[PDB]
Design a protein around this ligand. Sequence first.
Ligand SMILES: C[C@H](CCC(=O)O)NC(=O)c1cc[nH]n1
Ligand SMILES: C[C@H](CCC(=O)O)NC(=O)c1cc[nH]n1
Ligand SMILES: [Cl-]
Ligand SMILES: [Cl-]
Ligand SMILES: [Cl-]
Ligand SMILES: [Cl-]
Lengths: 413, 413
Amino acid sequence: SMSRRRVVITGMGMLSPLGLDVPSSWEGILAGRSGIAPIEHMDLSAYSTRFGGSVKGFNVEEYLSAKEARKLDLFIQYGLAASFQAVRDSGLEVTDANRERIGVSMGSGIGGLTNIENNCRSLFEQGPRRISPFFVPGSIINMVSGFLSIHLGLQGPNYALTTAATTGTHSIGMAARNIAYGEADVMVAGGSEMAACGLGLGGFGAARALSTRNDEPTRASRPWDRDRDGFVLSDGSGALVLEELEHARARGARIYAELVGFGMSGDAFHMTAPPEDGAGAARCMKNALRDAGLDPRQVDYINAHGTSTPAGDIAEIAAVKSVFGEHAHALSMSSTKSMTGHLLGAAGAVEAIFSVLALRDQVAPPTINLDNPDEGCDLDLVAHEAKPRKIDVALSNSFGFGGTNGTLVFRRF
Amino acid sequence: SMSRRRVVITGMGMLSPLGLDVPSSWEGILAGRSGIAPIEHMDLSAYSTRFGGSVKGFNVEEYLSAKEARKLDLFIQYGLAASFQAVRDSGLEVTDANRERIGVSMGSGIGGLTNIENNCRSLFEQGPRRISPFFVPGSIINMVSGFLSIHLGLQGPNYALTTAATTGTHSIGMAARNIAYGEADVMVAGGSEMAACGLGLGGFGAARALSTRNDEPTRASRPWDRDRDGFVLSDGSGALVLEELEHARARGARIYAELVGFGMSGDAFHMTAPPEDGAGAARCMKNALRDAGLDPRQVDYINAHGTSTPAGDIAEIAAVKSVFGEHAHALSMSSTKSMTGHLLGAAGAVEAIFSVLALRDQVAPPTINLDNPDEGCDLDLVAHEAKPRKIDVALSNSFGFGGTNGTLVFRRF
Ligand SMILES: C[C@H](CCC(=O)O)NC(=O)c1cc[nH]n1
Ligand SMILES: C[C@H](CCC(=O)O)NC(=O)c1cc[nH]n1
Ligand SMILES: [Cl-]
Ligand SMILES: [Cl-]
Ligand SMILES: [Cl-]
Ligand SMILES: [Cl-]
């Protein structure tokens, strides 16, 4: 704990509704662009929600051969894309000397819902003889970590989290712990999701979790706005190359930031709804700050969970107020879900990247669509437009079904 | 690493094809009873495999009210059952003083395949308005950890692994790390699975992973036997209460054993097939022994992965030979999958329990059906009948799709 190794971010990668890499996504974020649109090439006329954030124009053949790619669900494709981008971005070379010290932890919330839909259809219409032989290996959540390790020869710790909307945040935090306690020197960590099929929209629609603002998809995700009506379902991926500091310094790696804190908590409250005061979120953020050895006054920017739900958004404000007190009125906090929608198991991965870039570029991304902040939402929520400011420390929150909570703390380096 | 806290097992719980708790399962194991039978209340006439290990006579109402239980997929039901059994067995009392120091890590390989099947059927026949509102929260893998935390008021680290057949082993190992590095004082860890639906049998059947010995289901699982033809799909759950040693001693807990070692590796080889020498398994077992600070000569019993696959079984023997050398001929190694079949994400959880009970009762469980050991399978594989012997250290292996590997080391206490 006092003798643990320090962990830095040397590589990043992303597919989002705003772009096919980190630079293009971030340009969208800093412009206040929505990635949400009507979902195409899919007949959603029966569904109460017919829009979301899709990854537009993705070519898996930049990362995999066609033959390899056809084995895999889109969530795996997306996770490999972000991973390969992050590894490349890191400049790391995998050798016989280091391959056992490099692991992977790429998770998903829902996994291969699209493959399950297609295979279920084949099963019901034709029978079990039309199930793909790649159905199981190409749809299971740990096959990002698995295929990444195969393709790059990674022999270190190899696993996958699934903690709903918290997955990406946990995947990064726990990979950092791996490095900090010397179980690995490098980890590829993050997550991916592709739930914009009928089971996903249908499932989340039946749970009454989604916005139904079909007439104005770009206005649907509106965190802390009084006309919010639930979250927007989005697809994509994020990956970070985490690396022990001295390992990174020794090879002259470009270091984007230091991952100084990781906190976890459980609400122990409700399956899908938070406690109204956000007490689990508060405990989680405290754990993270204490983990980082930071005073709350050192936090400059919070990338909120901020999913555009009635209860969730207000609970998150209550938690930030509780943890930060008067300093809650000094920091900036925004929800990039206003633009990206909710990427579920990838949300914390892409939001970790946006947090790192906020530190790099000294700029708080906007919460777009925040026209009439609800009762109690009186913080600097960066309404409408990106805000240049001093950011030495950034915090990223994720909260998921089951009351599972994760916070990461990043520090300028 | 040198200053980490020690971790002991103070509670255990299980549903398996051999019983509805730990004592009844273990009685079956020590008798050499098969849990495999034709799967009933399910029309499998179109499928190439029509048998498996089902949990027979389970009453979820012993653990949950009917109202709560109807929200949840069977895999969640099974995981809560084992968890509640383990917590009860531990004698731990959850209070305002300790609830933030008690977490949960219960995983699954496949998750709520049964719920997805049912909901997919409703979606296709009727439309998205017949999807259950509980479909998403009651089918996602992290809802064991989530519901357990809600029901028992656990506010500590709350997560879920999904690493195929390795899930249960990773869930225990990583929960132990939580305690060892002081992120929690107690963890409920393990896994659960219920894949014996059509998508599971169909999926694994299309992948050519399963035995098709429909005429003699009890003979199908035959690890290291020359007539093996793939694994047997089984359902169930296992949970351990892990606890910091001084915490357990201070409350006078009954301690079953000490969890001394956890190792991970990745093969970085093939999606579904191992390297023929089992080199990943070897690295993993070495990592675990080094983690435990044990000489290979200290291992008395190995609970093998031993799934009854052509390549897998031989690769595991090669790995044990490589790691243990001449001591490979001194230990006993058995596969309890001979009796239980392959519980997928729960396999390592139930096999951790069988390893702990081997230490408690000084007895190596049998590998039943091992009539003609294949070329190279010349170890003490405990063919046919349980073998009383000295066991101070037991090792449990799990290997999963993606080449992800896990080993746990338990020591008498
Ligand atoms: C239970 C919800 C999960 C959010 C999601 O599905 O992404 N949690 C919150 O909304 C929340 C707010 C503050 N703390 N938890
Ligand atoms: C790739 C397989 C996974 C086994 C399973 O699906 O449960 N791995 C082995 O069989 C194996 C044997 C030795 N090392 N890995
Ligand atoms: Cl298909
Ligand atoms: Cl619009
Ligand atoms: Cl239904
Ligand atoms: Cl039989």
